[PDB]
Design a protein around this ligand. Structure first.
Ligand SMILES: Nc1ncnc2c1ncn2[C@@H]1O[C@H](CSCC[C@H](N)C(=O)O)[C@@H](O)[C@H]1O
Ligand SMILES: Nc1ncnc2c1ncn2[C@@H]1O[C@H](CSCC[C@H](N)C(=O)O)[C@@H](O)[C@H]1O
Ligand SMILES: O=S(=O)(O)CCCNC(CO)(CO)CO
Ligand SMILES: O=S(=O)(O)CCCNC(CO)(CO)CO
Lengths: 349, 349
């Protein structure tokens, strides 16, 4: 016996341990496929590509052709390619690698590249130091400033981040604009942390009479010009949010601790309750629901929750969301499914 | 439809993509558990540990207790802890986390730490540059020298590596010494790339009449002193291997390309065929066998094969091994299972 167990039981446990020690290879191989432009090469080929044609296009040295084959077979087994064998081995796209093809409705390749930046993803080697920090975020530990300040000083990172945020924007924004219950009766809305206006443009295109303010950090909105009913305001959501009939928070609250979310939600409440008005706040973020979601979906949401250590953020379940809303002085809330992993939450002051 | 597919099909593919983009979190969370000494804490506790007692021992700030809980639940779901719920949530070890407990027959925690070094594991961000190198290894790209030269210049790395190699040594070495077919009739053996003599000591303890030479790089064996029939020789296996009745190659050939393995095997053949003798070479390494191994085992071996990009190495199947042996001028070979992932291969000149 080994470790008080049958050798066969130990071998099974060793296999599990190795799967996890080496899990980073799943990430790194996927990154490599995107960096080598393989999904687009195959799409452009118009049929499954032979290994010989693939390496010919890539112009890899002959000494590394077998390494390409090994990586392709590894990716295929993970579900990113289909191997078809005739005279030669060939590689076809799958639905998952079709998500990496430029100029698709949903092209998520920019998310792969942003998340797997060596410095950002490398930050996760410092979970131990981070867990001992009373206040710092994981990125605060590794980058030497807060994340938003870091983006302001590093334009290539700012671009990578913006592209990653844009990569699922059409789908979410279109699902949002199709929610008439959100926009019925509004005369104005402020998109708090609204970025470069990606969401707001779709809103304005849908509802040409609606006043829309894109609100974000001064550096984010500097030099952007609005049109007719769309304007940009630079500011700090922790200090003052412009008055409107409604606030939108898309992918905002999951970036912050409960304490910081409280501060934001207080400013949002103020924005929608000026001069006797009683507006509302509309939130787009994940809602964890272990009882109702499919297990695989719950698992991804739990993973994202762990990933949010980067900003001391959180992916919240309904009880967690409710506790925030009550502490922030909102009277009631409603949660609806929106698209994929995301819900639409409305709160009423 | 999205990307020519039903939205539900796209959501399933998105979940797969996210699993892989974020796979590195599996590695990083495991590393964190080891760095925080959690498996040992639980072992020493003697029963499953409550979250409150765990965080008390760790002395984490109160603001990060929930983060500990989230990480523990993530690790538990992966199989490294069992959650037991009564008045509180508590965490028990599993067979897999028992592999991380100091002073077990098989303690693999040093392997977790060596593999997941930020610089070594971070090298895998450079698969693209590496694939375009005619000669360089992945570590050669990122470390700016060959790996063995790097260890010679960086003692903390050399220590980490040695500890990682030691972590499964007892099991393998004991399985080896129990193979009487290997040692029957030998008067001498040279352990080529034999390290600090870990294997050779077990051999000599088992077979006190057998002459054993531990052969490795000068820096590795400098200052080591042998006893009775165990000696150390510093050298270069690419240039000259000391004469003996047999050569052992434990975890050697998987570190090299086919071309380099040929060079090594030629020197091994020379070592066992001096002065009319006809000895043999004994190899300990993985043998991939998709037809015969359990699928989960094959998957780990294929993963290790991908991982060996670090040194342009390879985990070989039987046809691959055979082609090397034939090209190196050996007449016949035999493969036997040894322990866990490893086989024992004997080749005859
Ligand atoms: N103090 C602050 N005030 C206003 N915006 C802030 C802020 N701190 C961060 N942000 C903004 O919060 C956003 C989070 S990313 C989400 C952006 C956008 N709603 C989208 O869906 O693409 C960024 O644009 C960031 O600049
Ligand atoms: N040119 C060379 N000549 C001799 N040994 C070499 C070598 N290049 C690398 N090595 C050795 O090959 C070994 C690979 S690691 C395996 C070590 C040992 N057999 C064990 O099982 O623990 C290292 O000890 C390394 O120093
Ligand atoms: O968000 S960063 O950490 O990059 C910069 C600090 C921002 N501070 C706030 C203070 O209220 C929020 O913590 C906003 O100005
Ligand atoms: O192995 S390293 O890359 O760290 C150093 C180079 C060793 N060169 C050899 C030449 O025969 C093998 O490639 C051995 O001296």
């Amino acid at each position: 016996s080994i470790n008080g167990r049958k050798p066969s039981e130990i071998f099974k446990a060793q296999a599990l341990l190795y799967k996890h020690i080496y899990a980073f290879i799943d990430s790194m191989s996927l990154k490599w496929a995107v960096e080598m432009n393989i999904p687009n090469i195959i799409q452009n080929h118009g049929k499954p590509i032979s290994l010989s044609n693939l390496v010919s296009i890539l112009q890899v040295p002959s000494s590394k052709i077998g390494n390409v084959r090994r990586l392709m077979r590894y990716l295929a087994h993970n579900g990113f390619f289909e191997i078809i064998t005739k005279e030669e081995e060939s590689y076809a796209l799958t639905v998952a690698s079709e998500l990496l093809v430029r100029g698709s409705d949903l092209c998520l390749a920019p998310m792969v590249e942003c998340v797997l930046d060596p410095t950002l993803s490398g930050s996760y080697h410092e979970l131990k130091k981070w867990i001992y920090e009373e206040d710092l975020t994981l990125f605060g530990v590794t980058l030497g400033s807060g994340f938003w300040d870091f983006l302001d000083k590093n334009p290539e990172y700012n671009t990578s981040f913006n592209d990653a945020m844009a990569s699922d924007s059409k789908l979410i924004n279109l699902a949002l604009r199709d929610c008439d219950f959100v926009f019925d009766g509004l005369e104005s809305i402020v998109d708090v942390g609204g970025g470069t206006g990606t969401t707001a443009k779709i809103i304005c295109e849908t509802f040409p009479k609606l006043k829309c303010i894109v609100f974000d950090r001064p550096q984010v909105v500097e030099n952007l010009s609005g049109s007719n009913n769309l304007t940009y305001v630079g500011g700090d959501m922790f200090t003052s949010i412009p008055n409107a009939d409604a606030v939108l928070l898309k992918y905002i609250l999951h970036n912050w601790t409960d304490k910081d979310c409280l501060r934001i939600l207080k400013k949002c409440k103020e924005a929608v309750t000026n001069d006797g008005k009683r507006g509302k706040v509309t939130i787009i973020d994940m809602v964890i629901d272990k009882k109702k979601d499919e297990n695989q979906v719950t698992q991804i949401k739990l993973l994202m929750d762990v990933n949010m250590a980067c900003l001391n953020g959180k992916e919240r379940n309904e009880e967690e969301w409710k506790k925030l809303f009550i502490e922030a002085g909102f009277q009631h809330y409603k949660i609806s499914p929106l698209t994929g992993f995301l819900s639409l939450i409305e709160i009423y002051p």
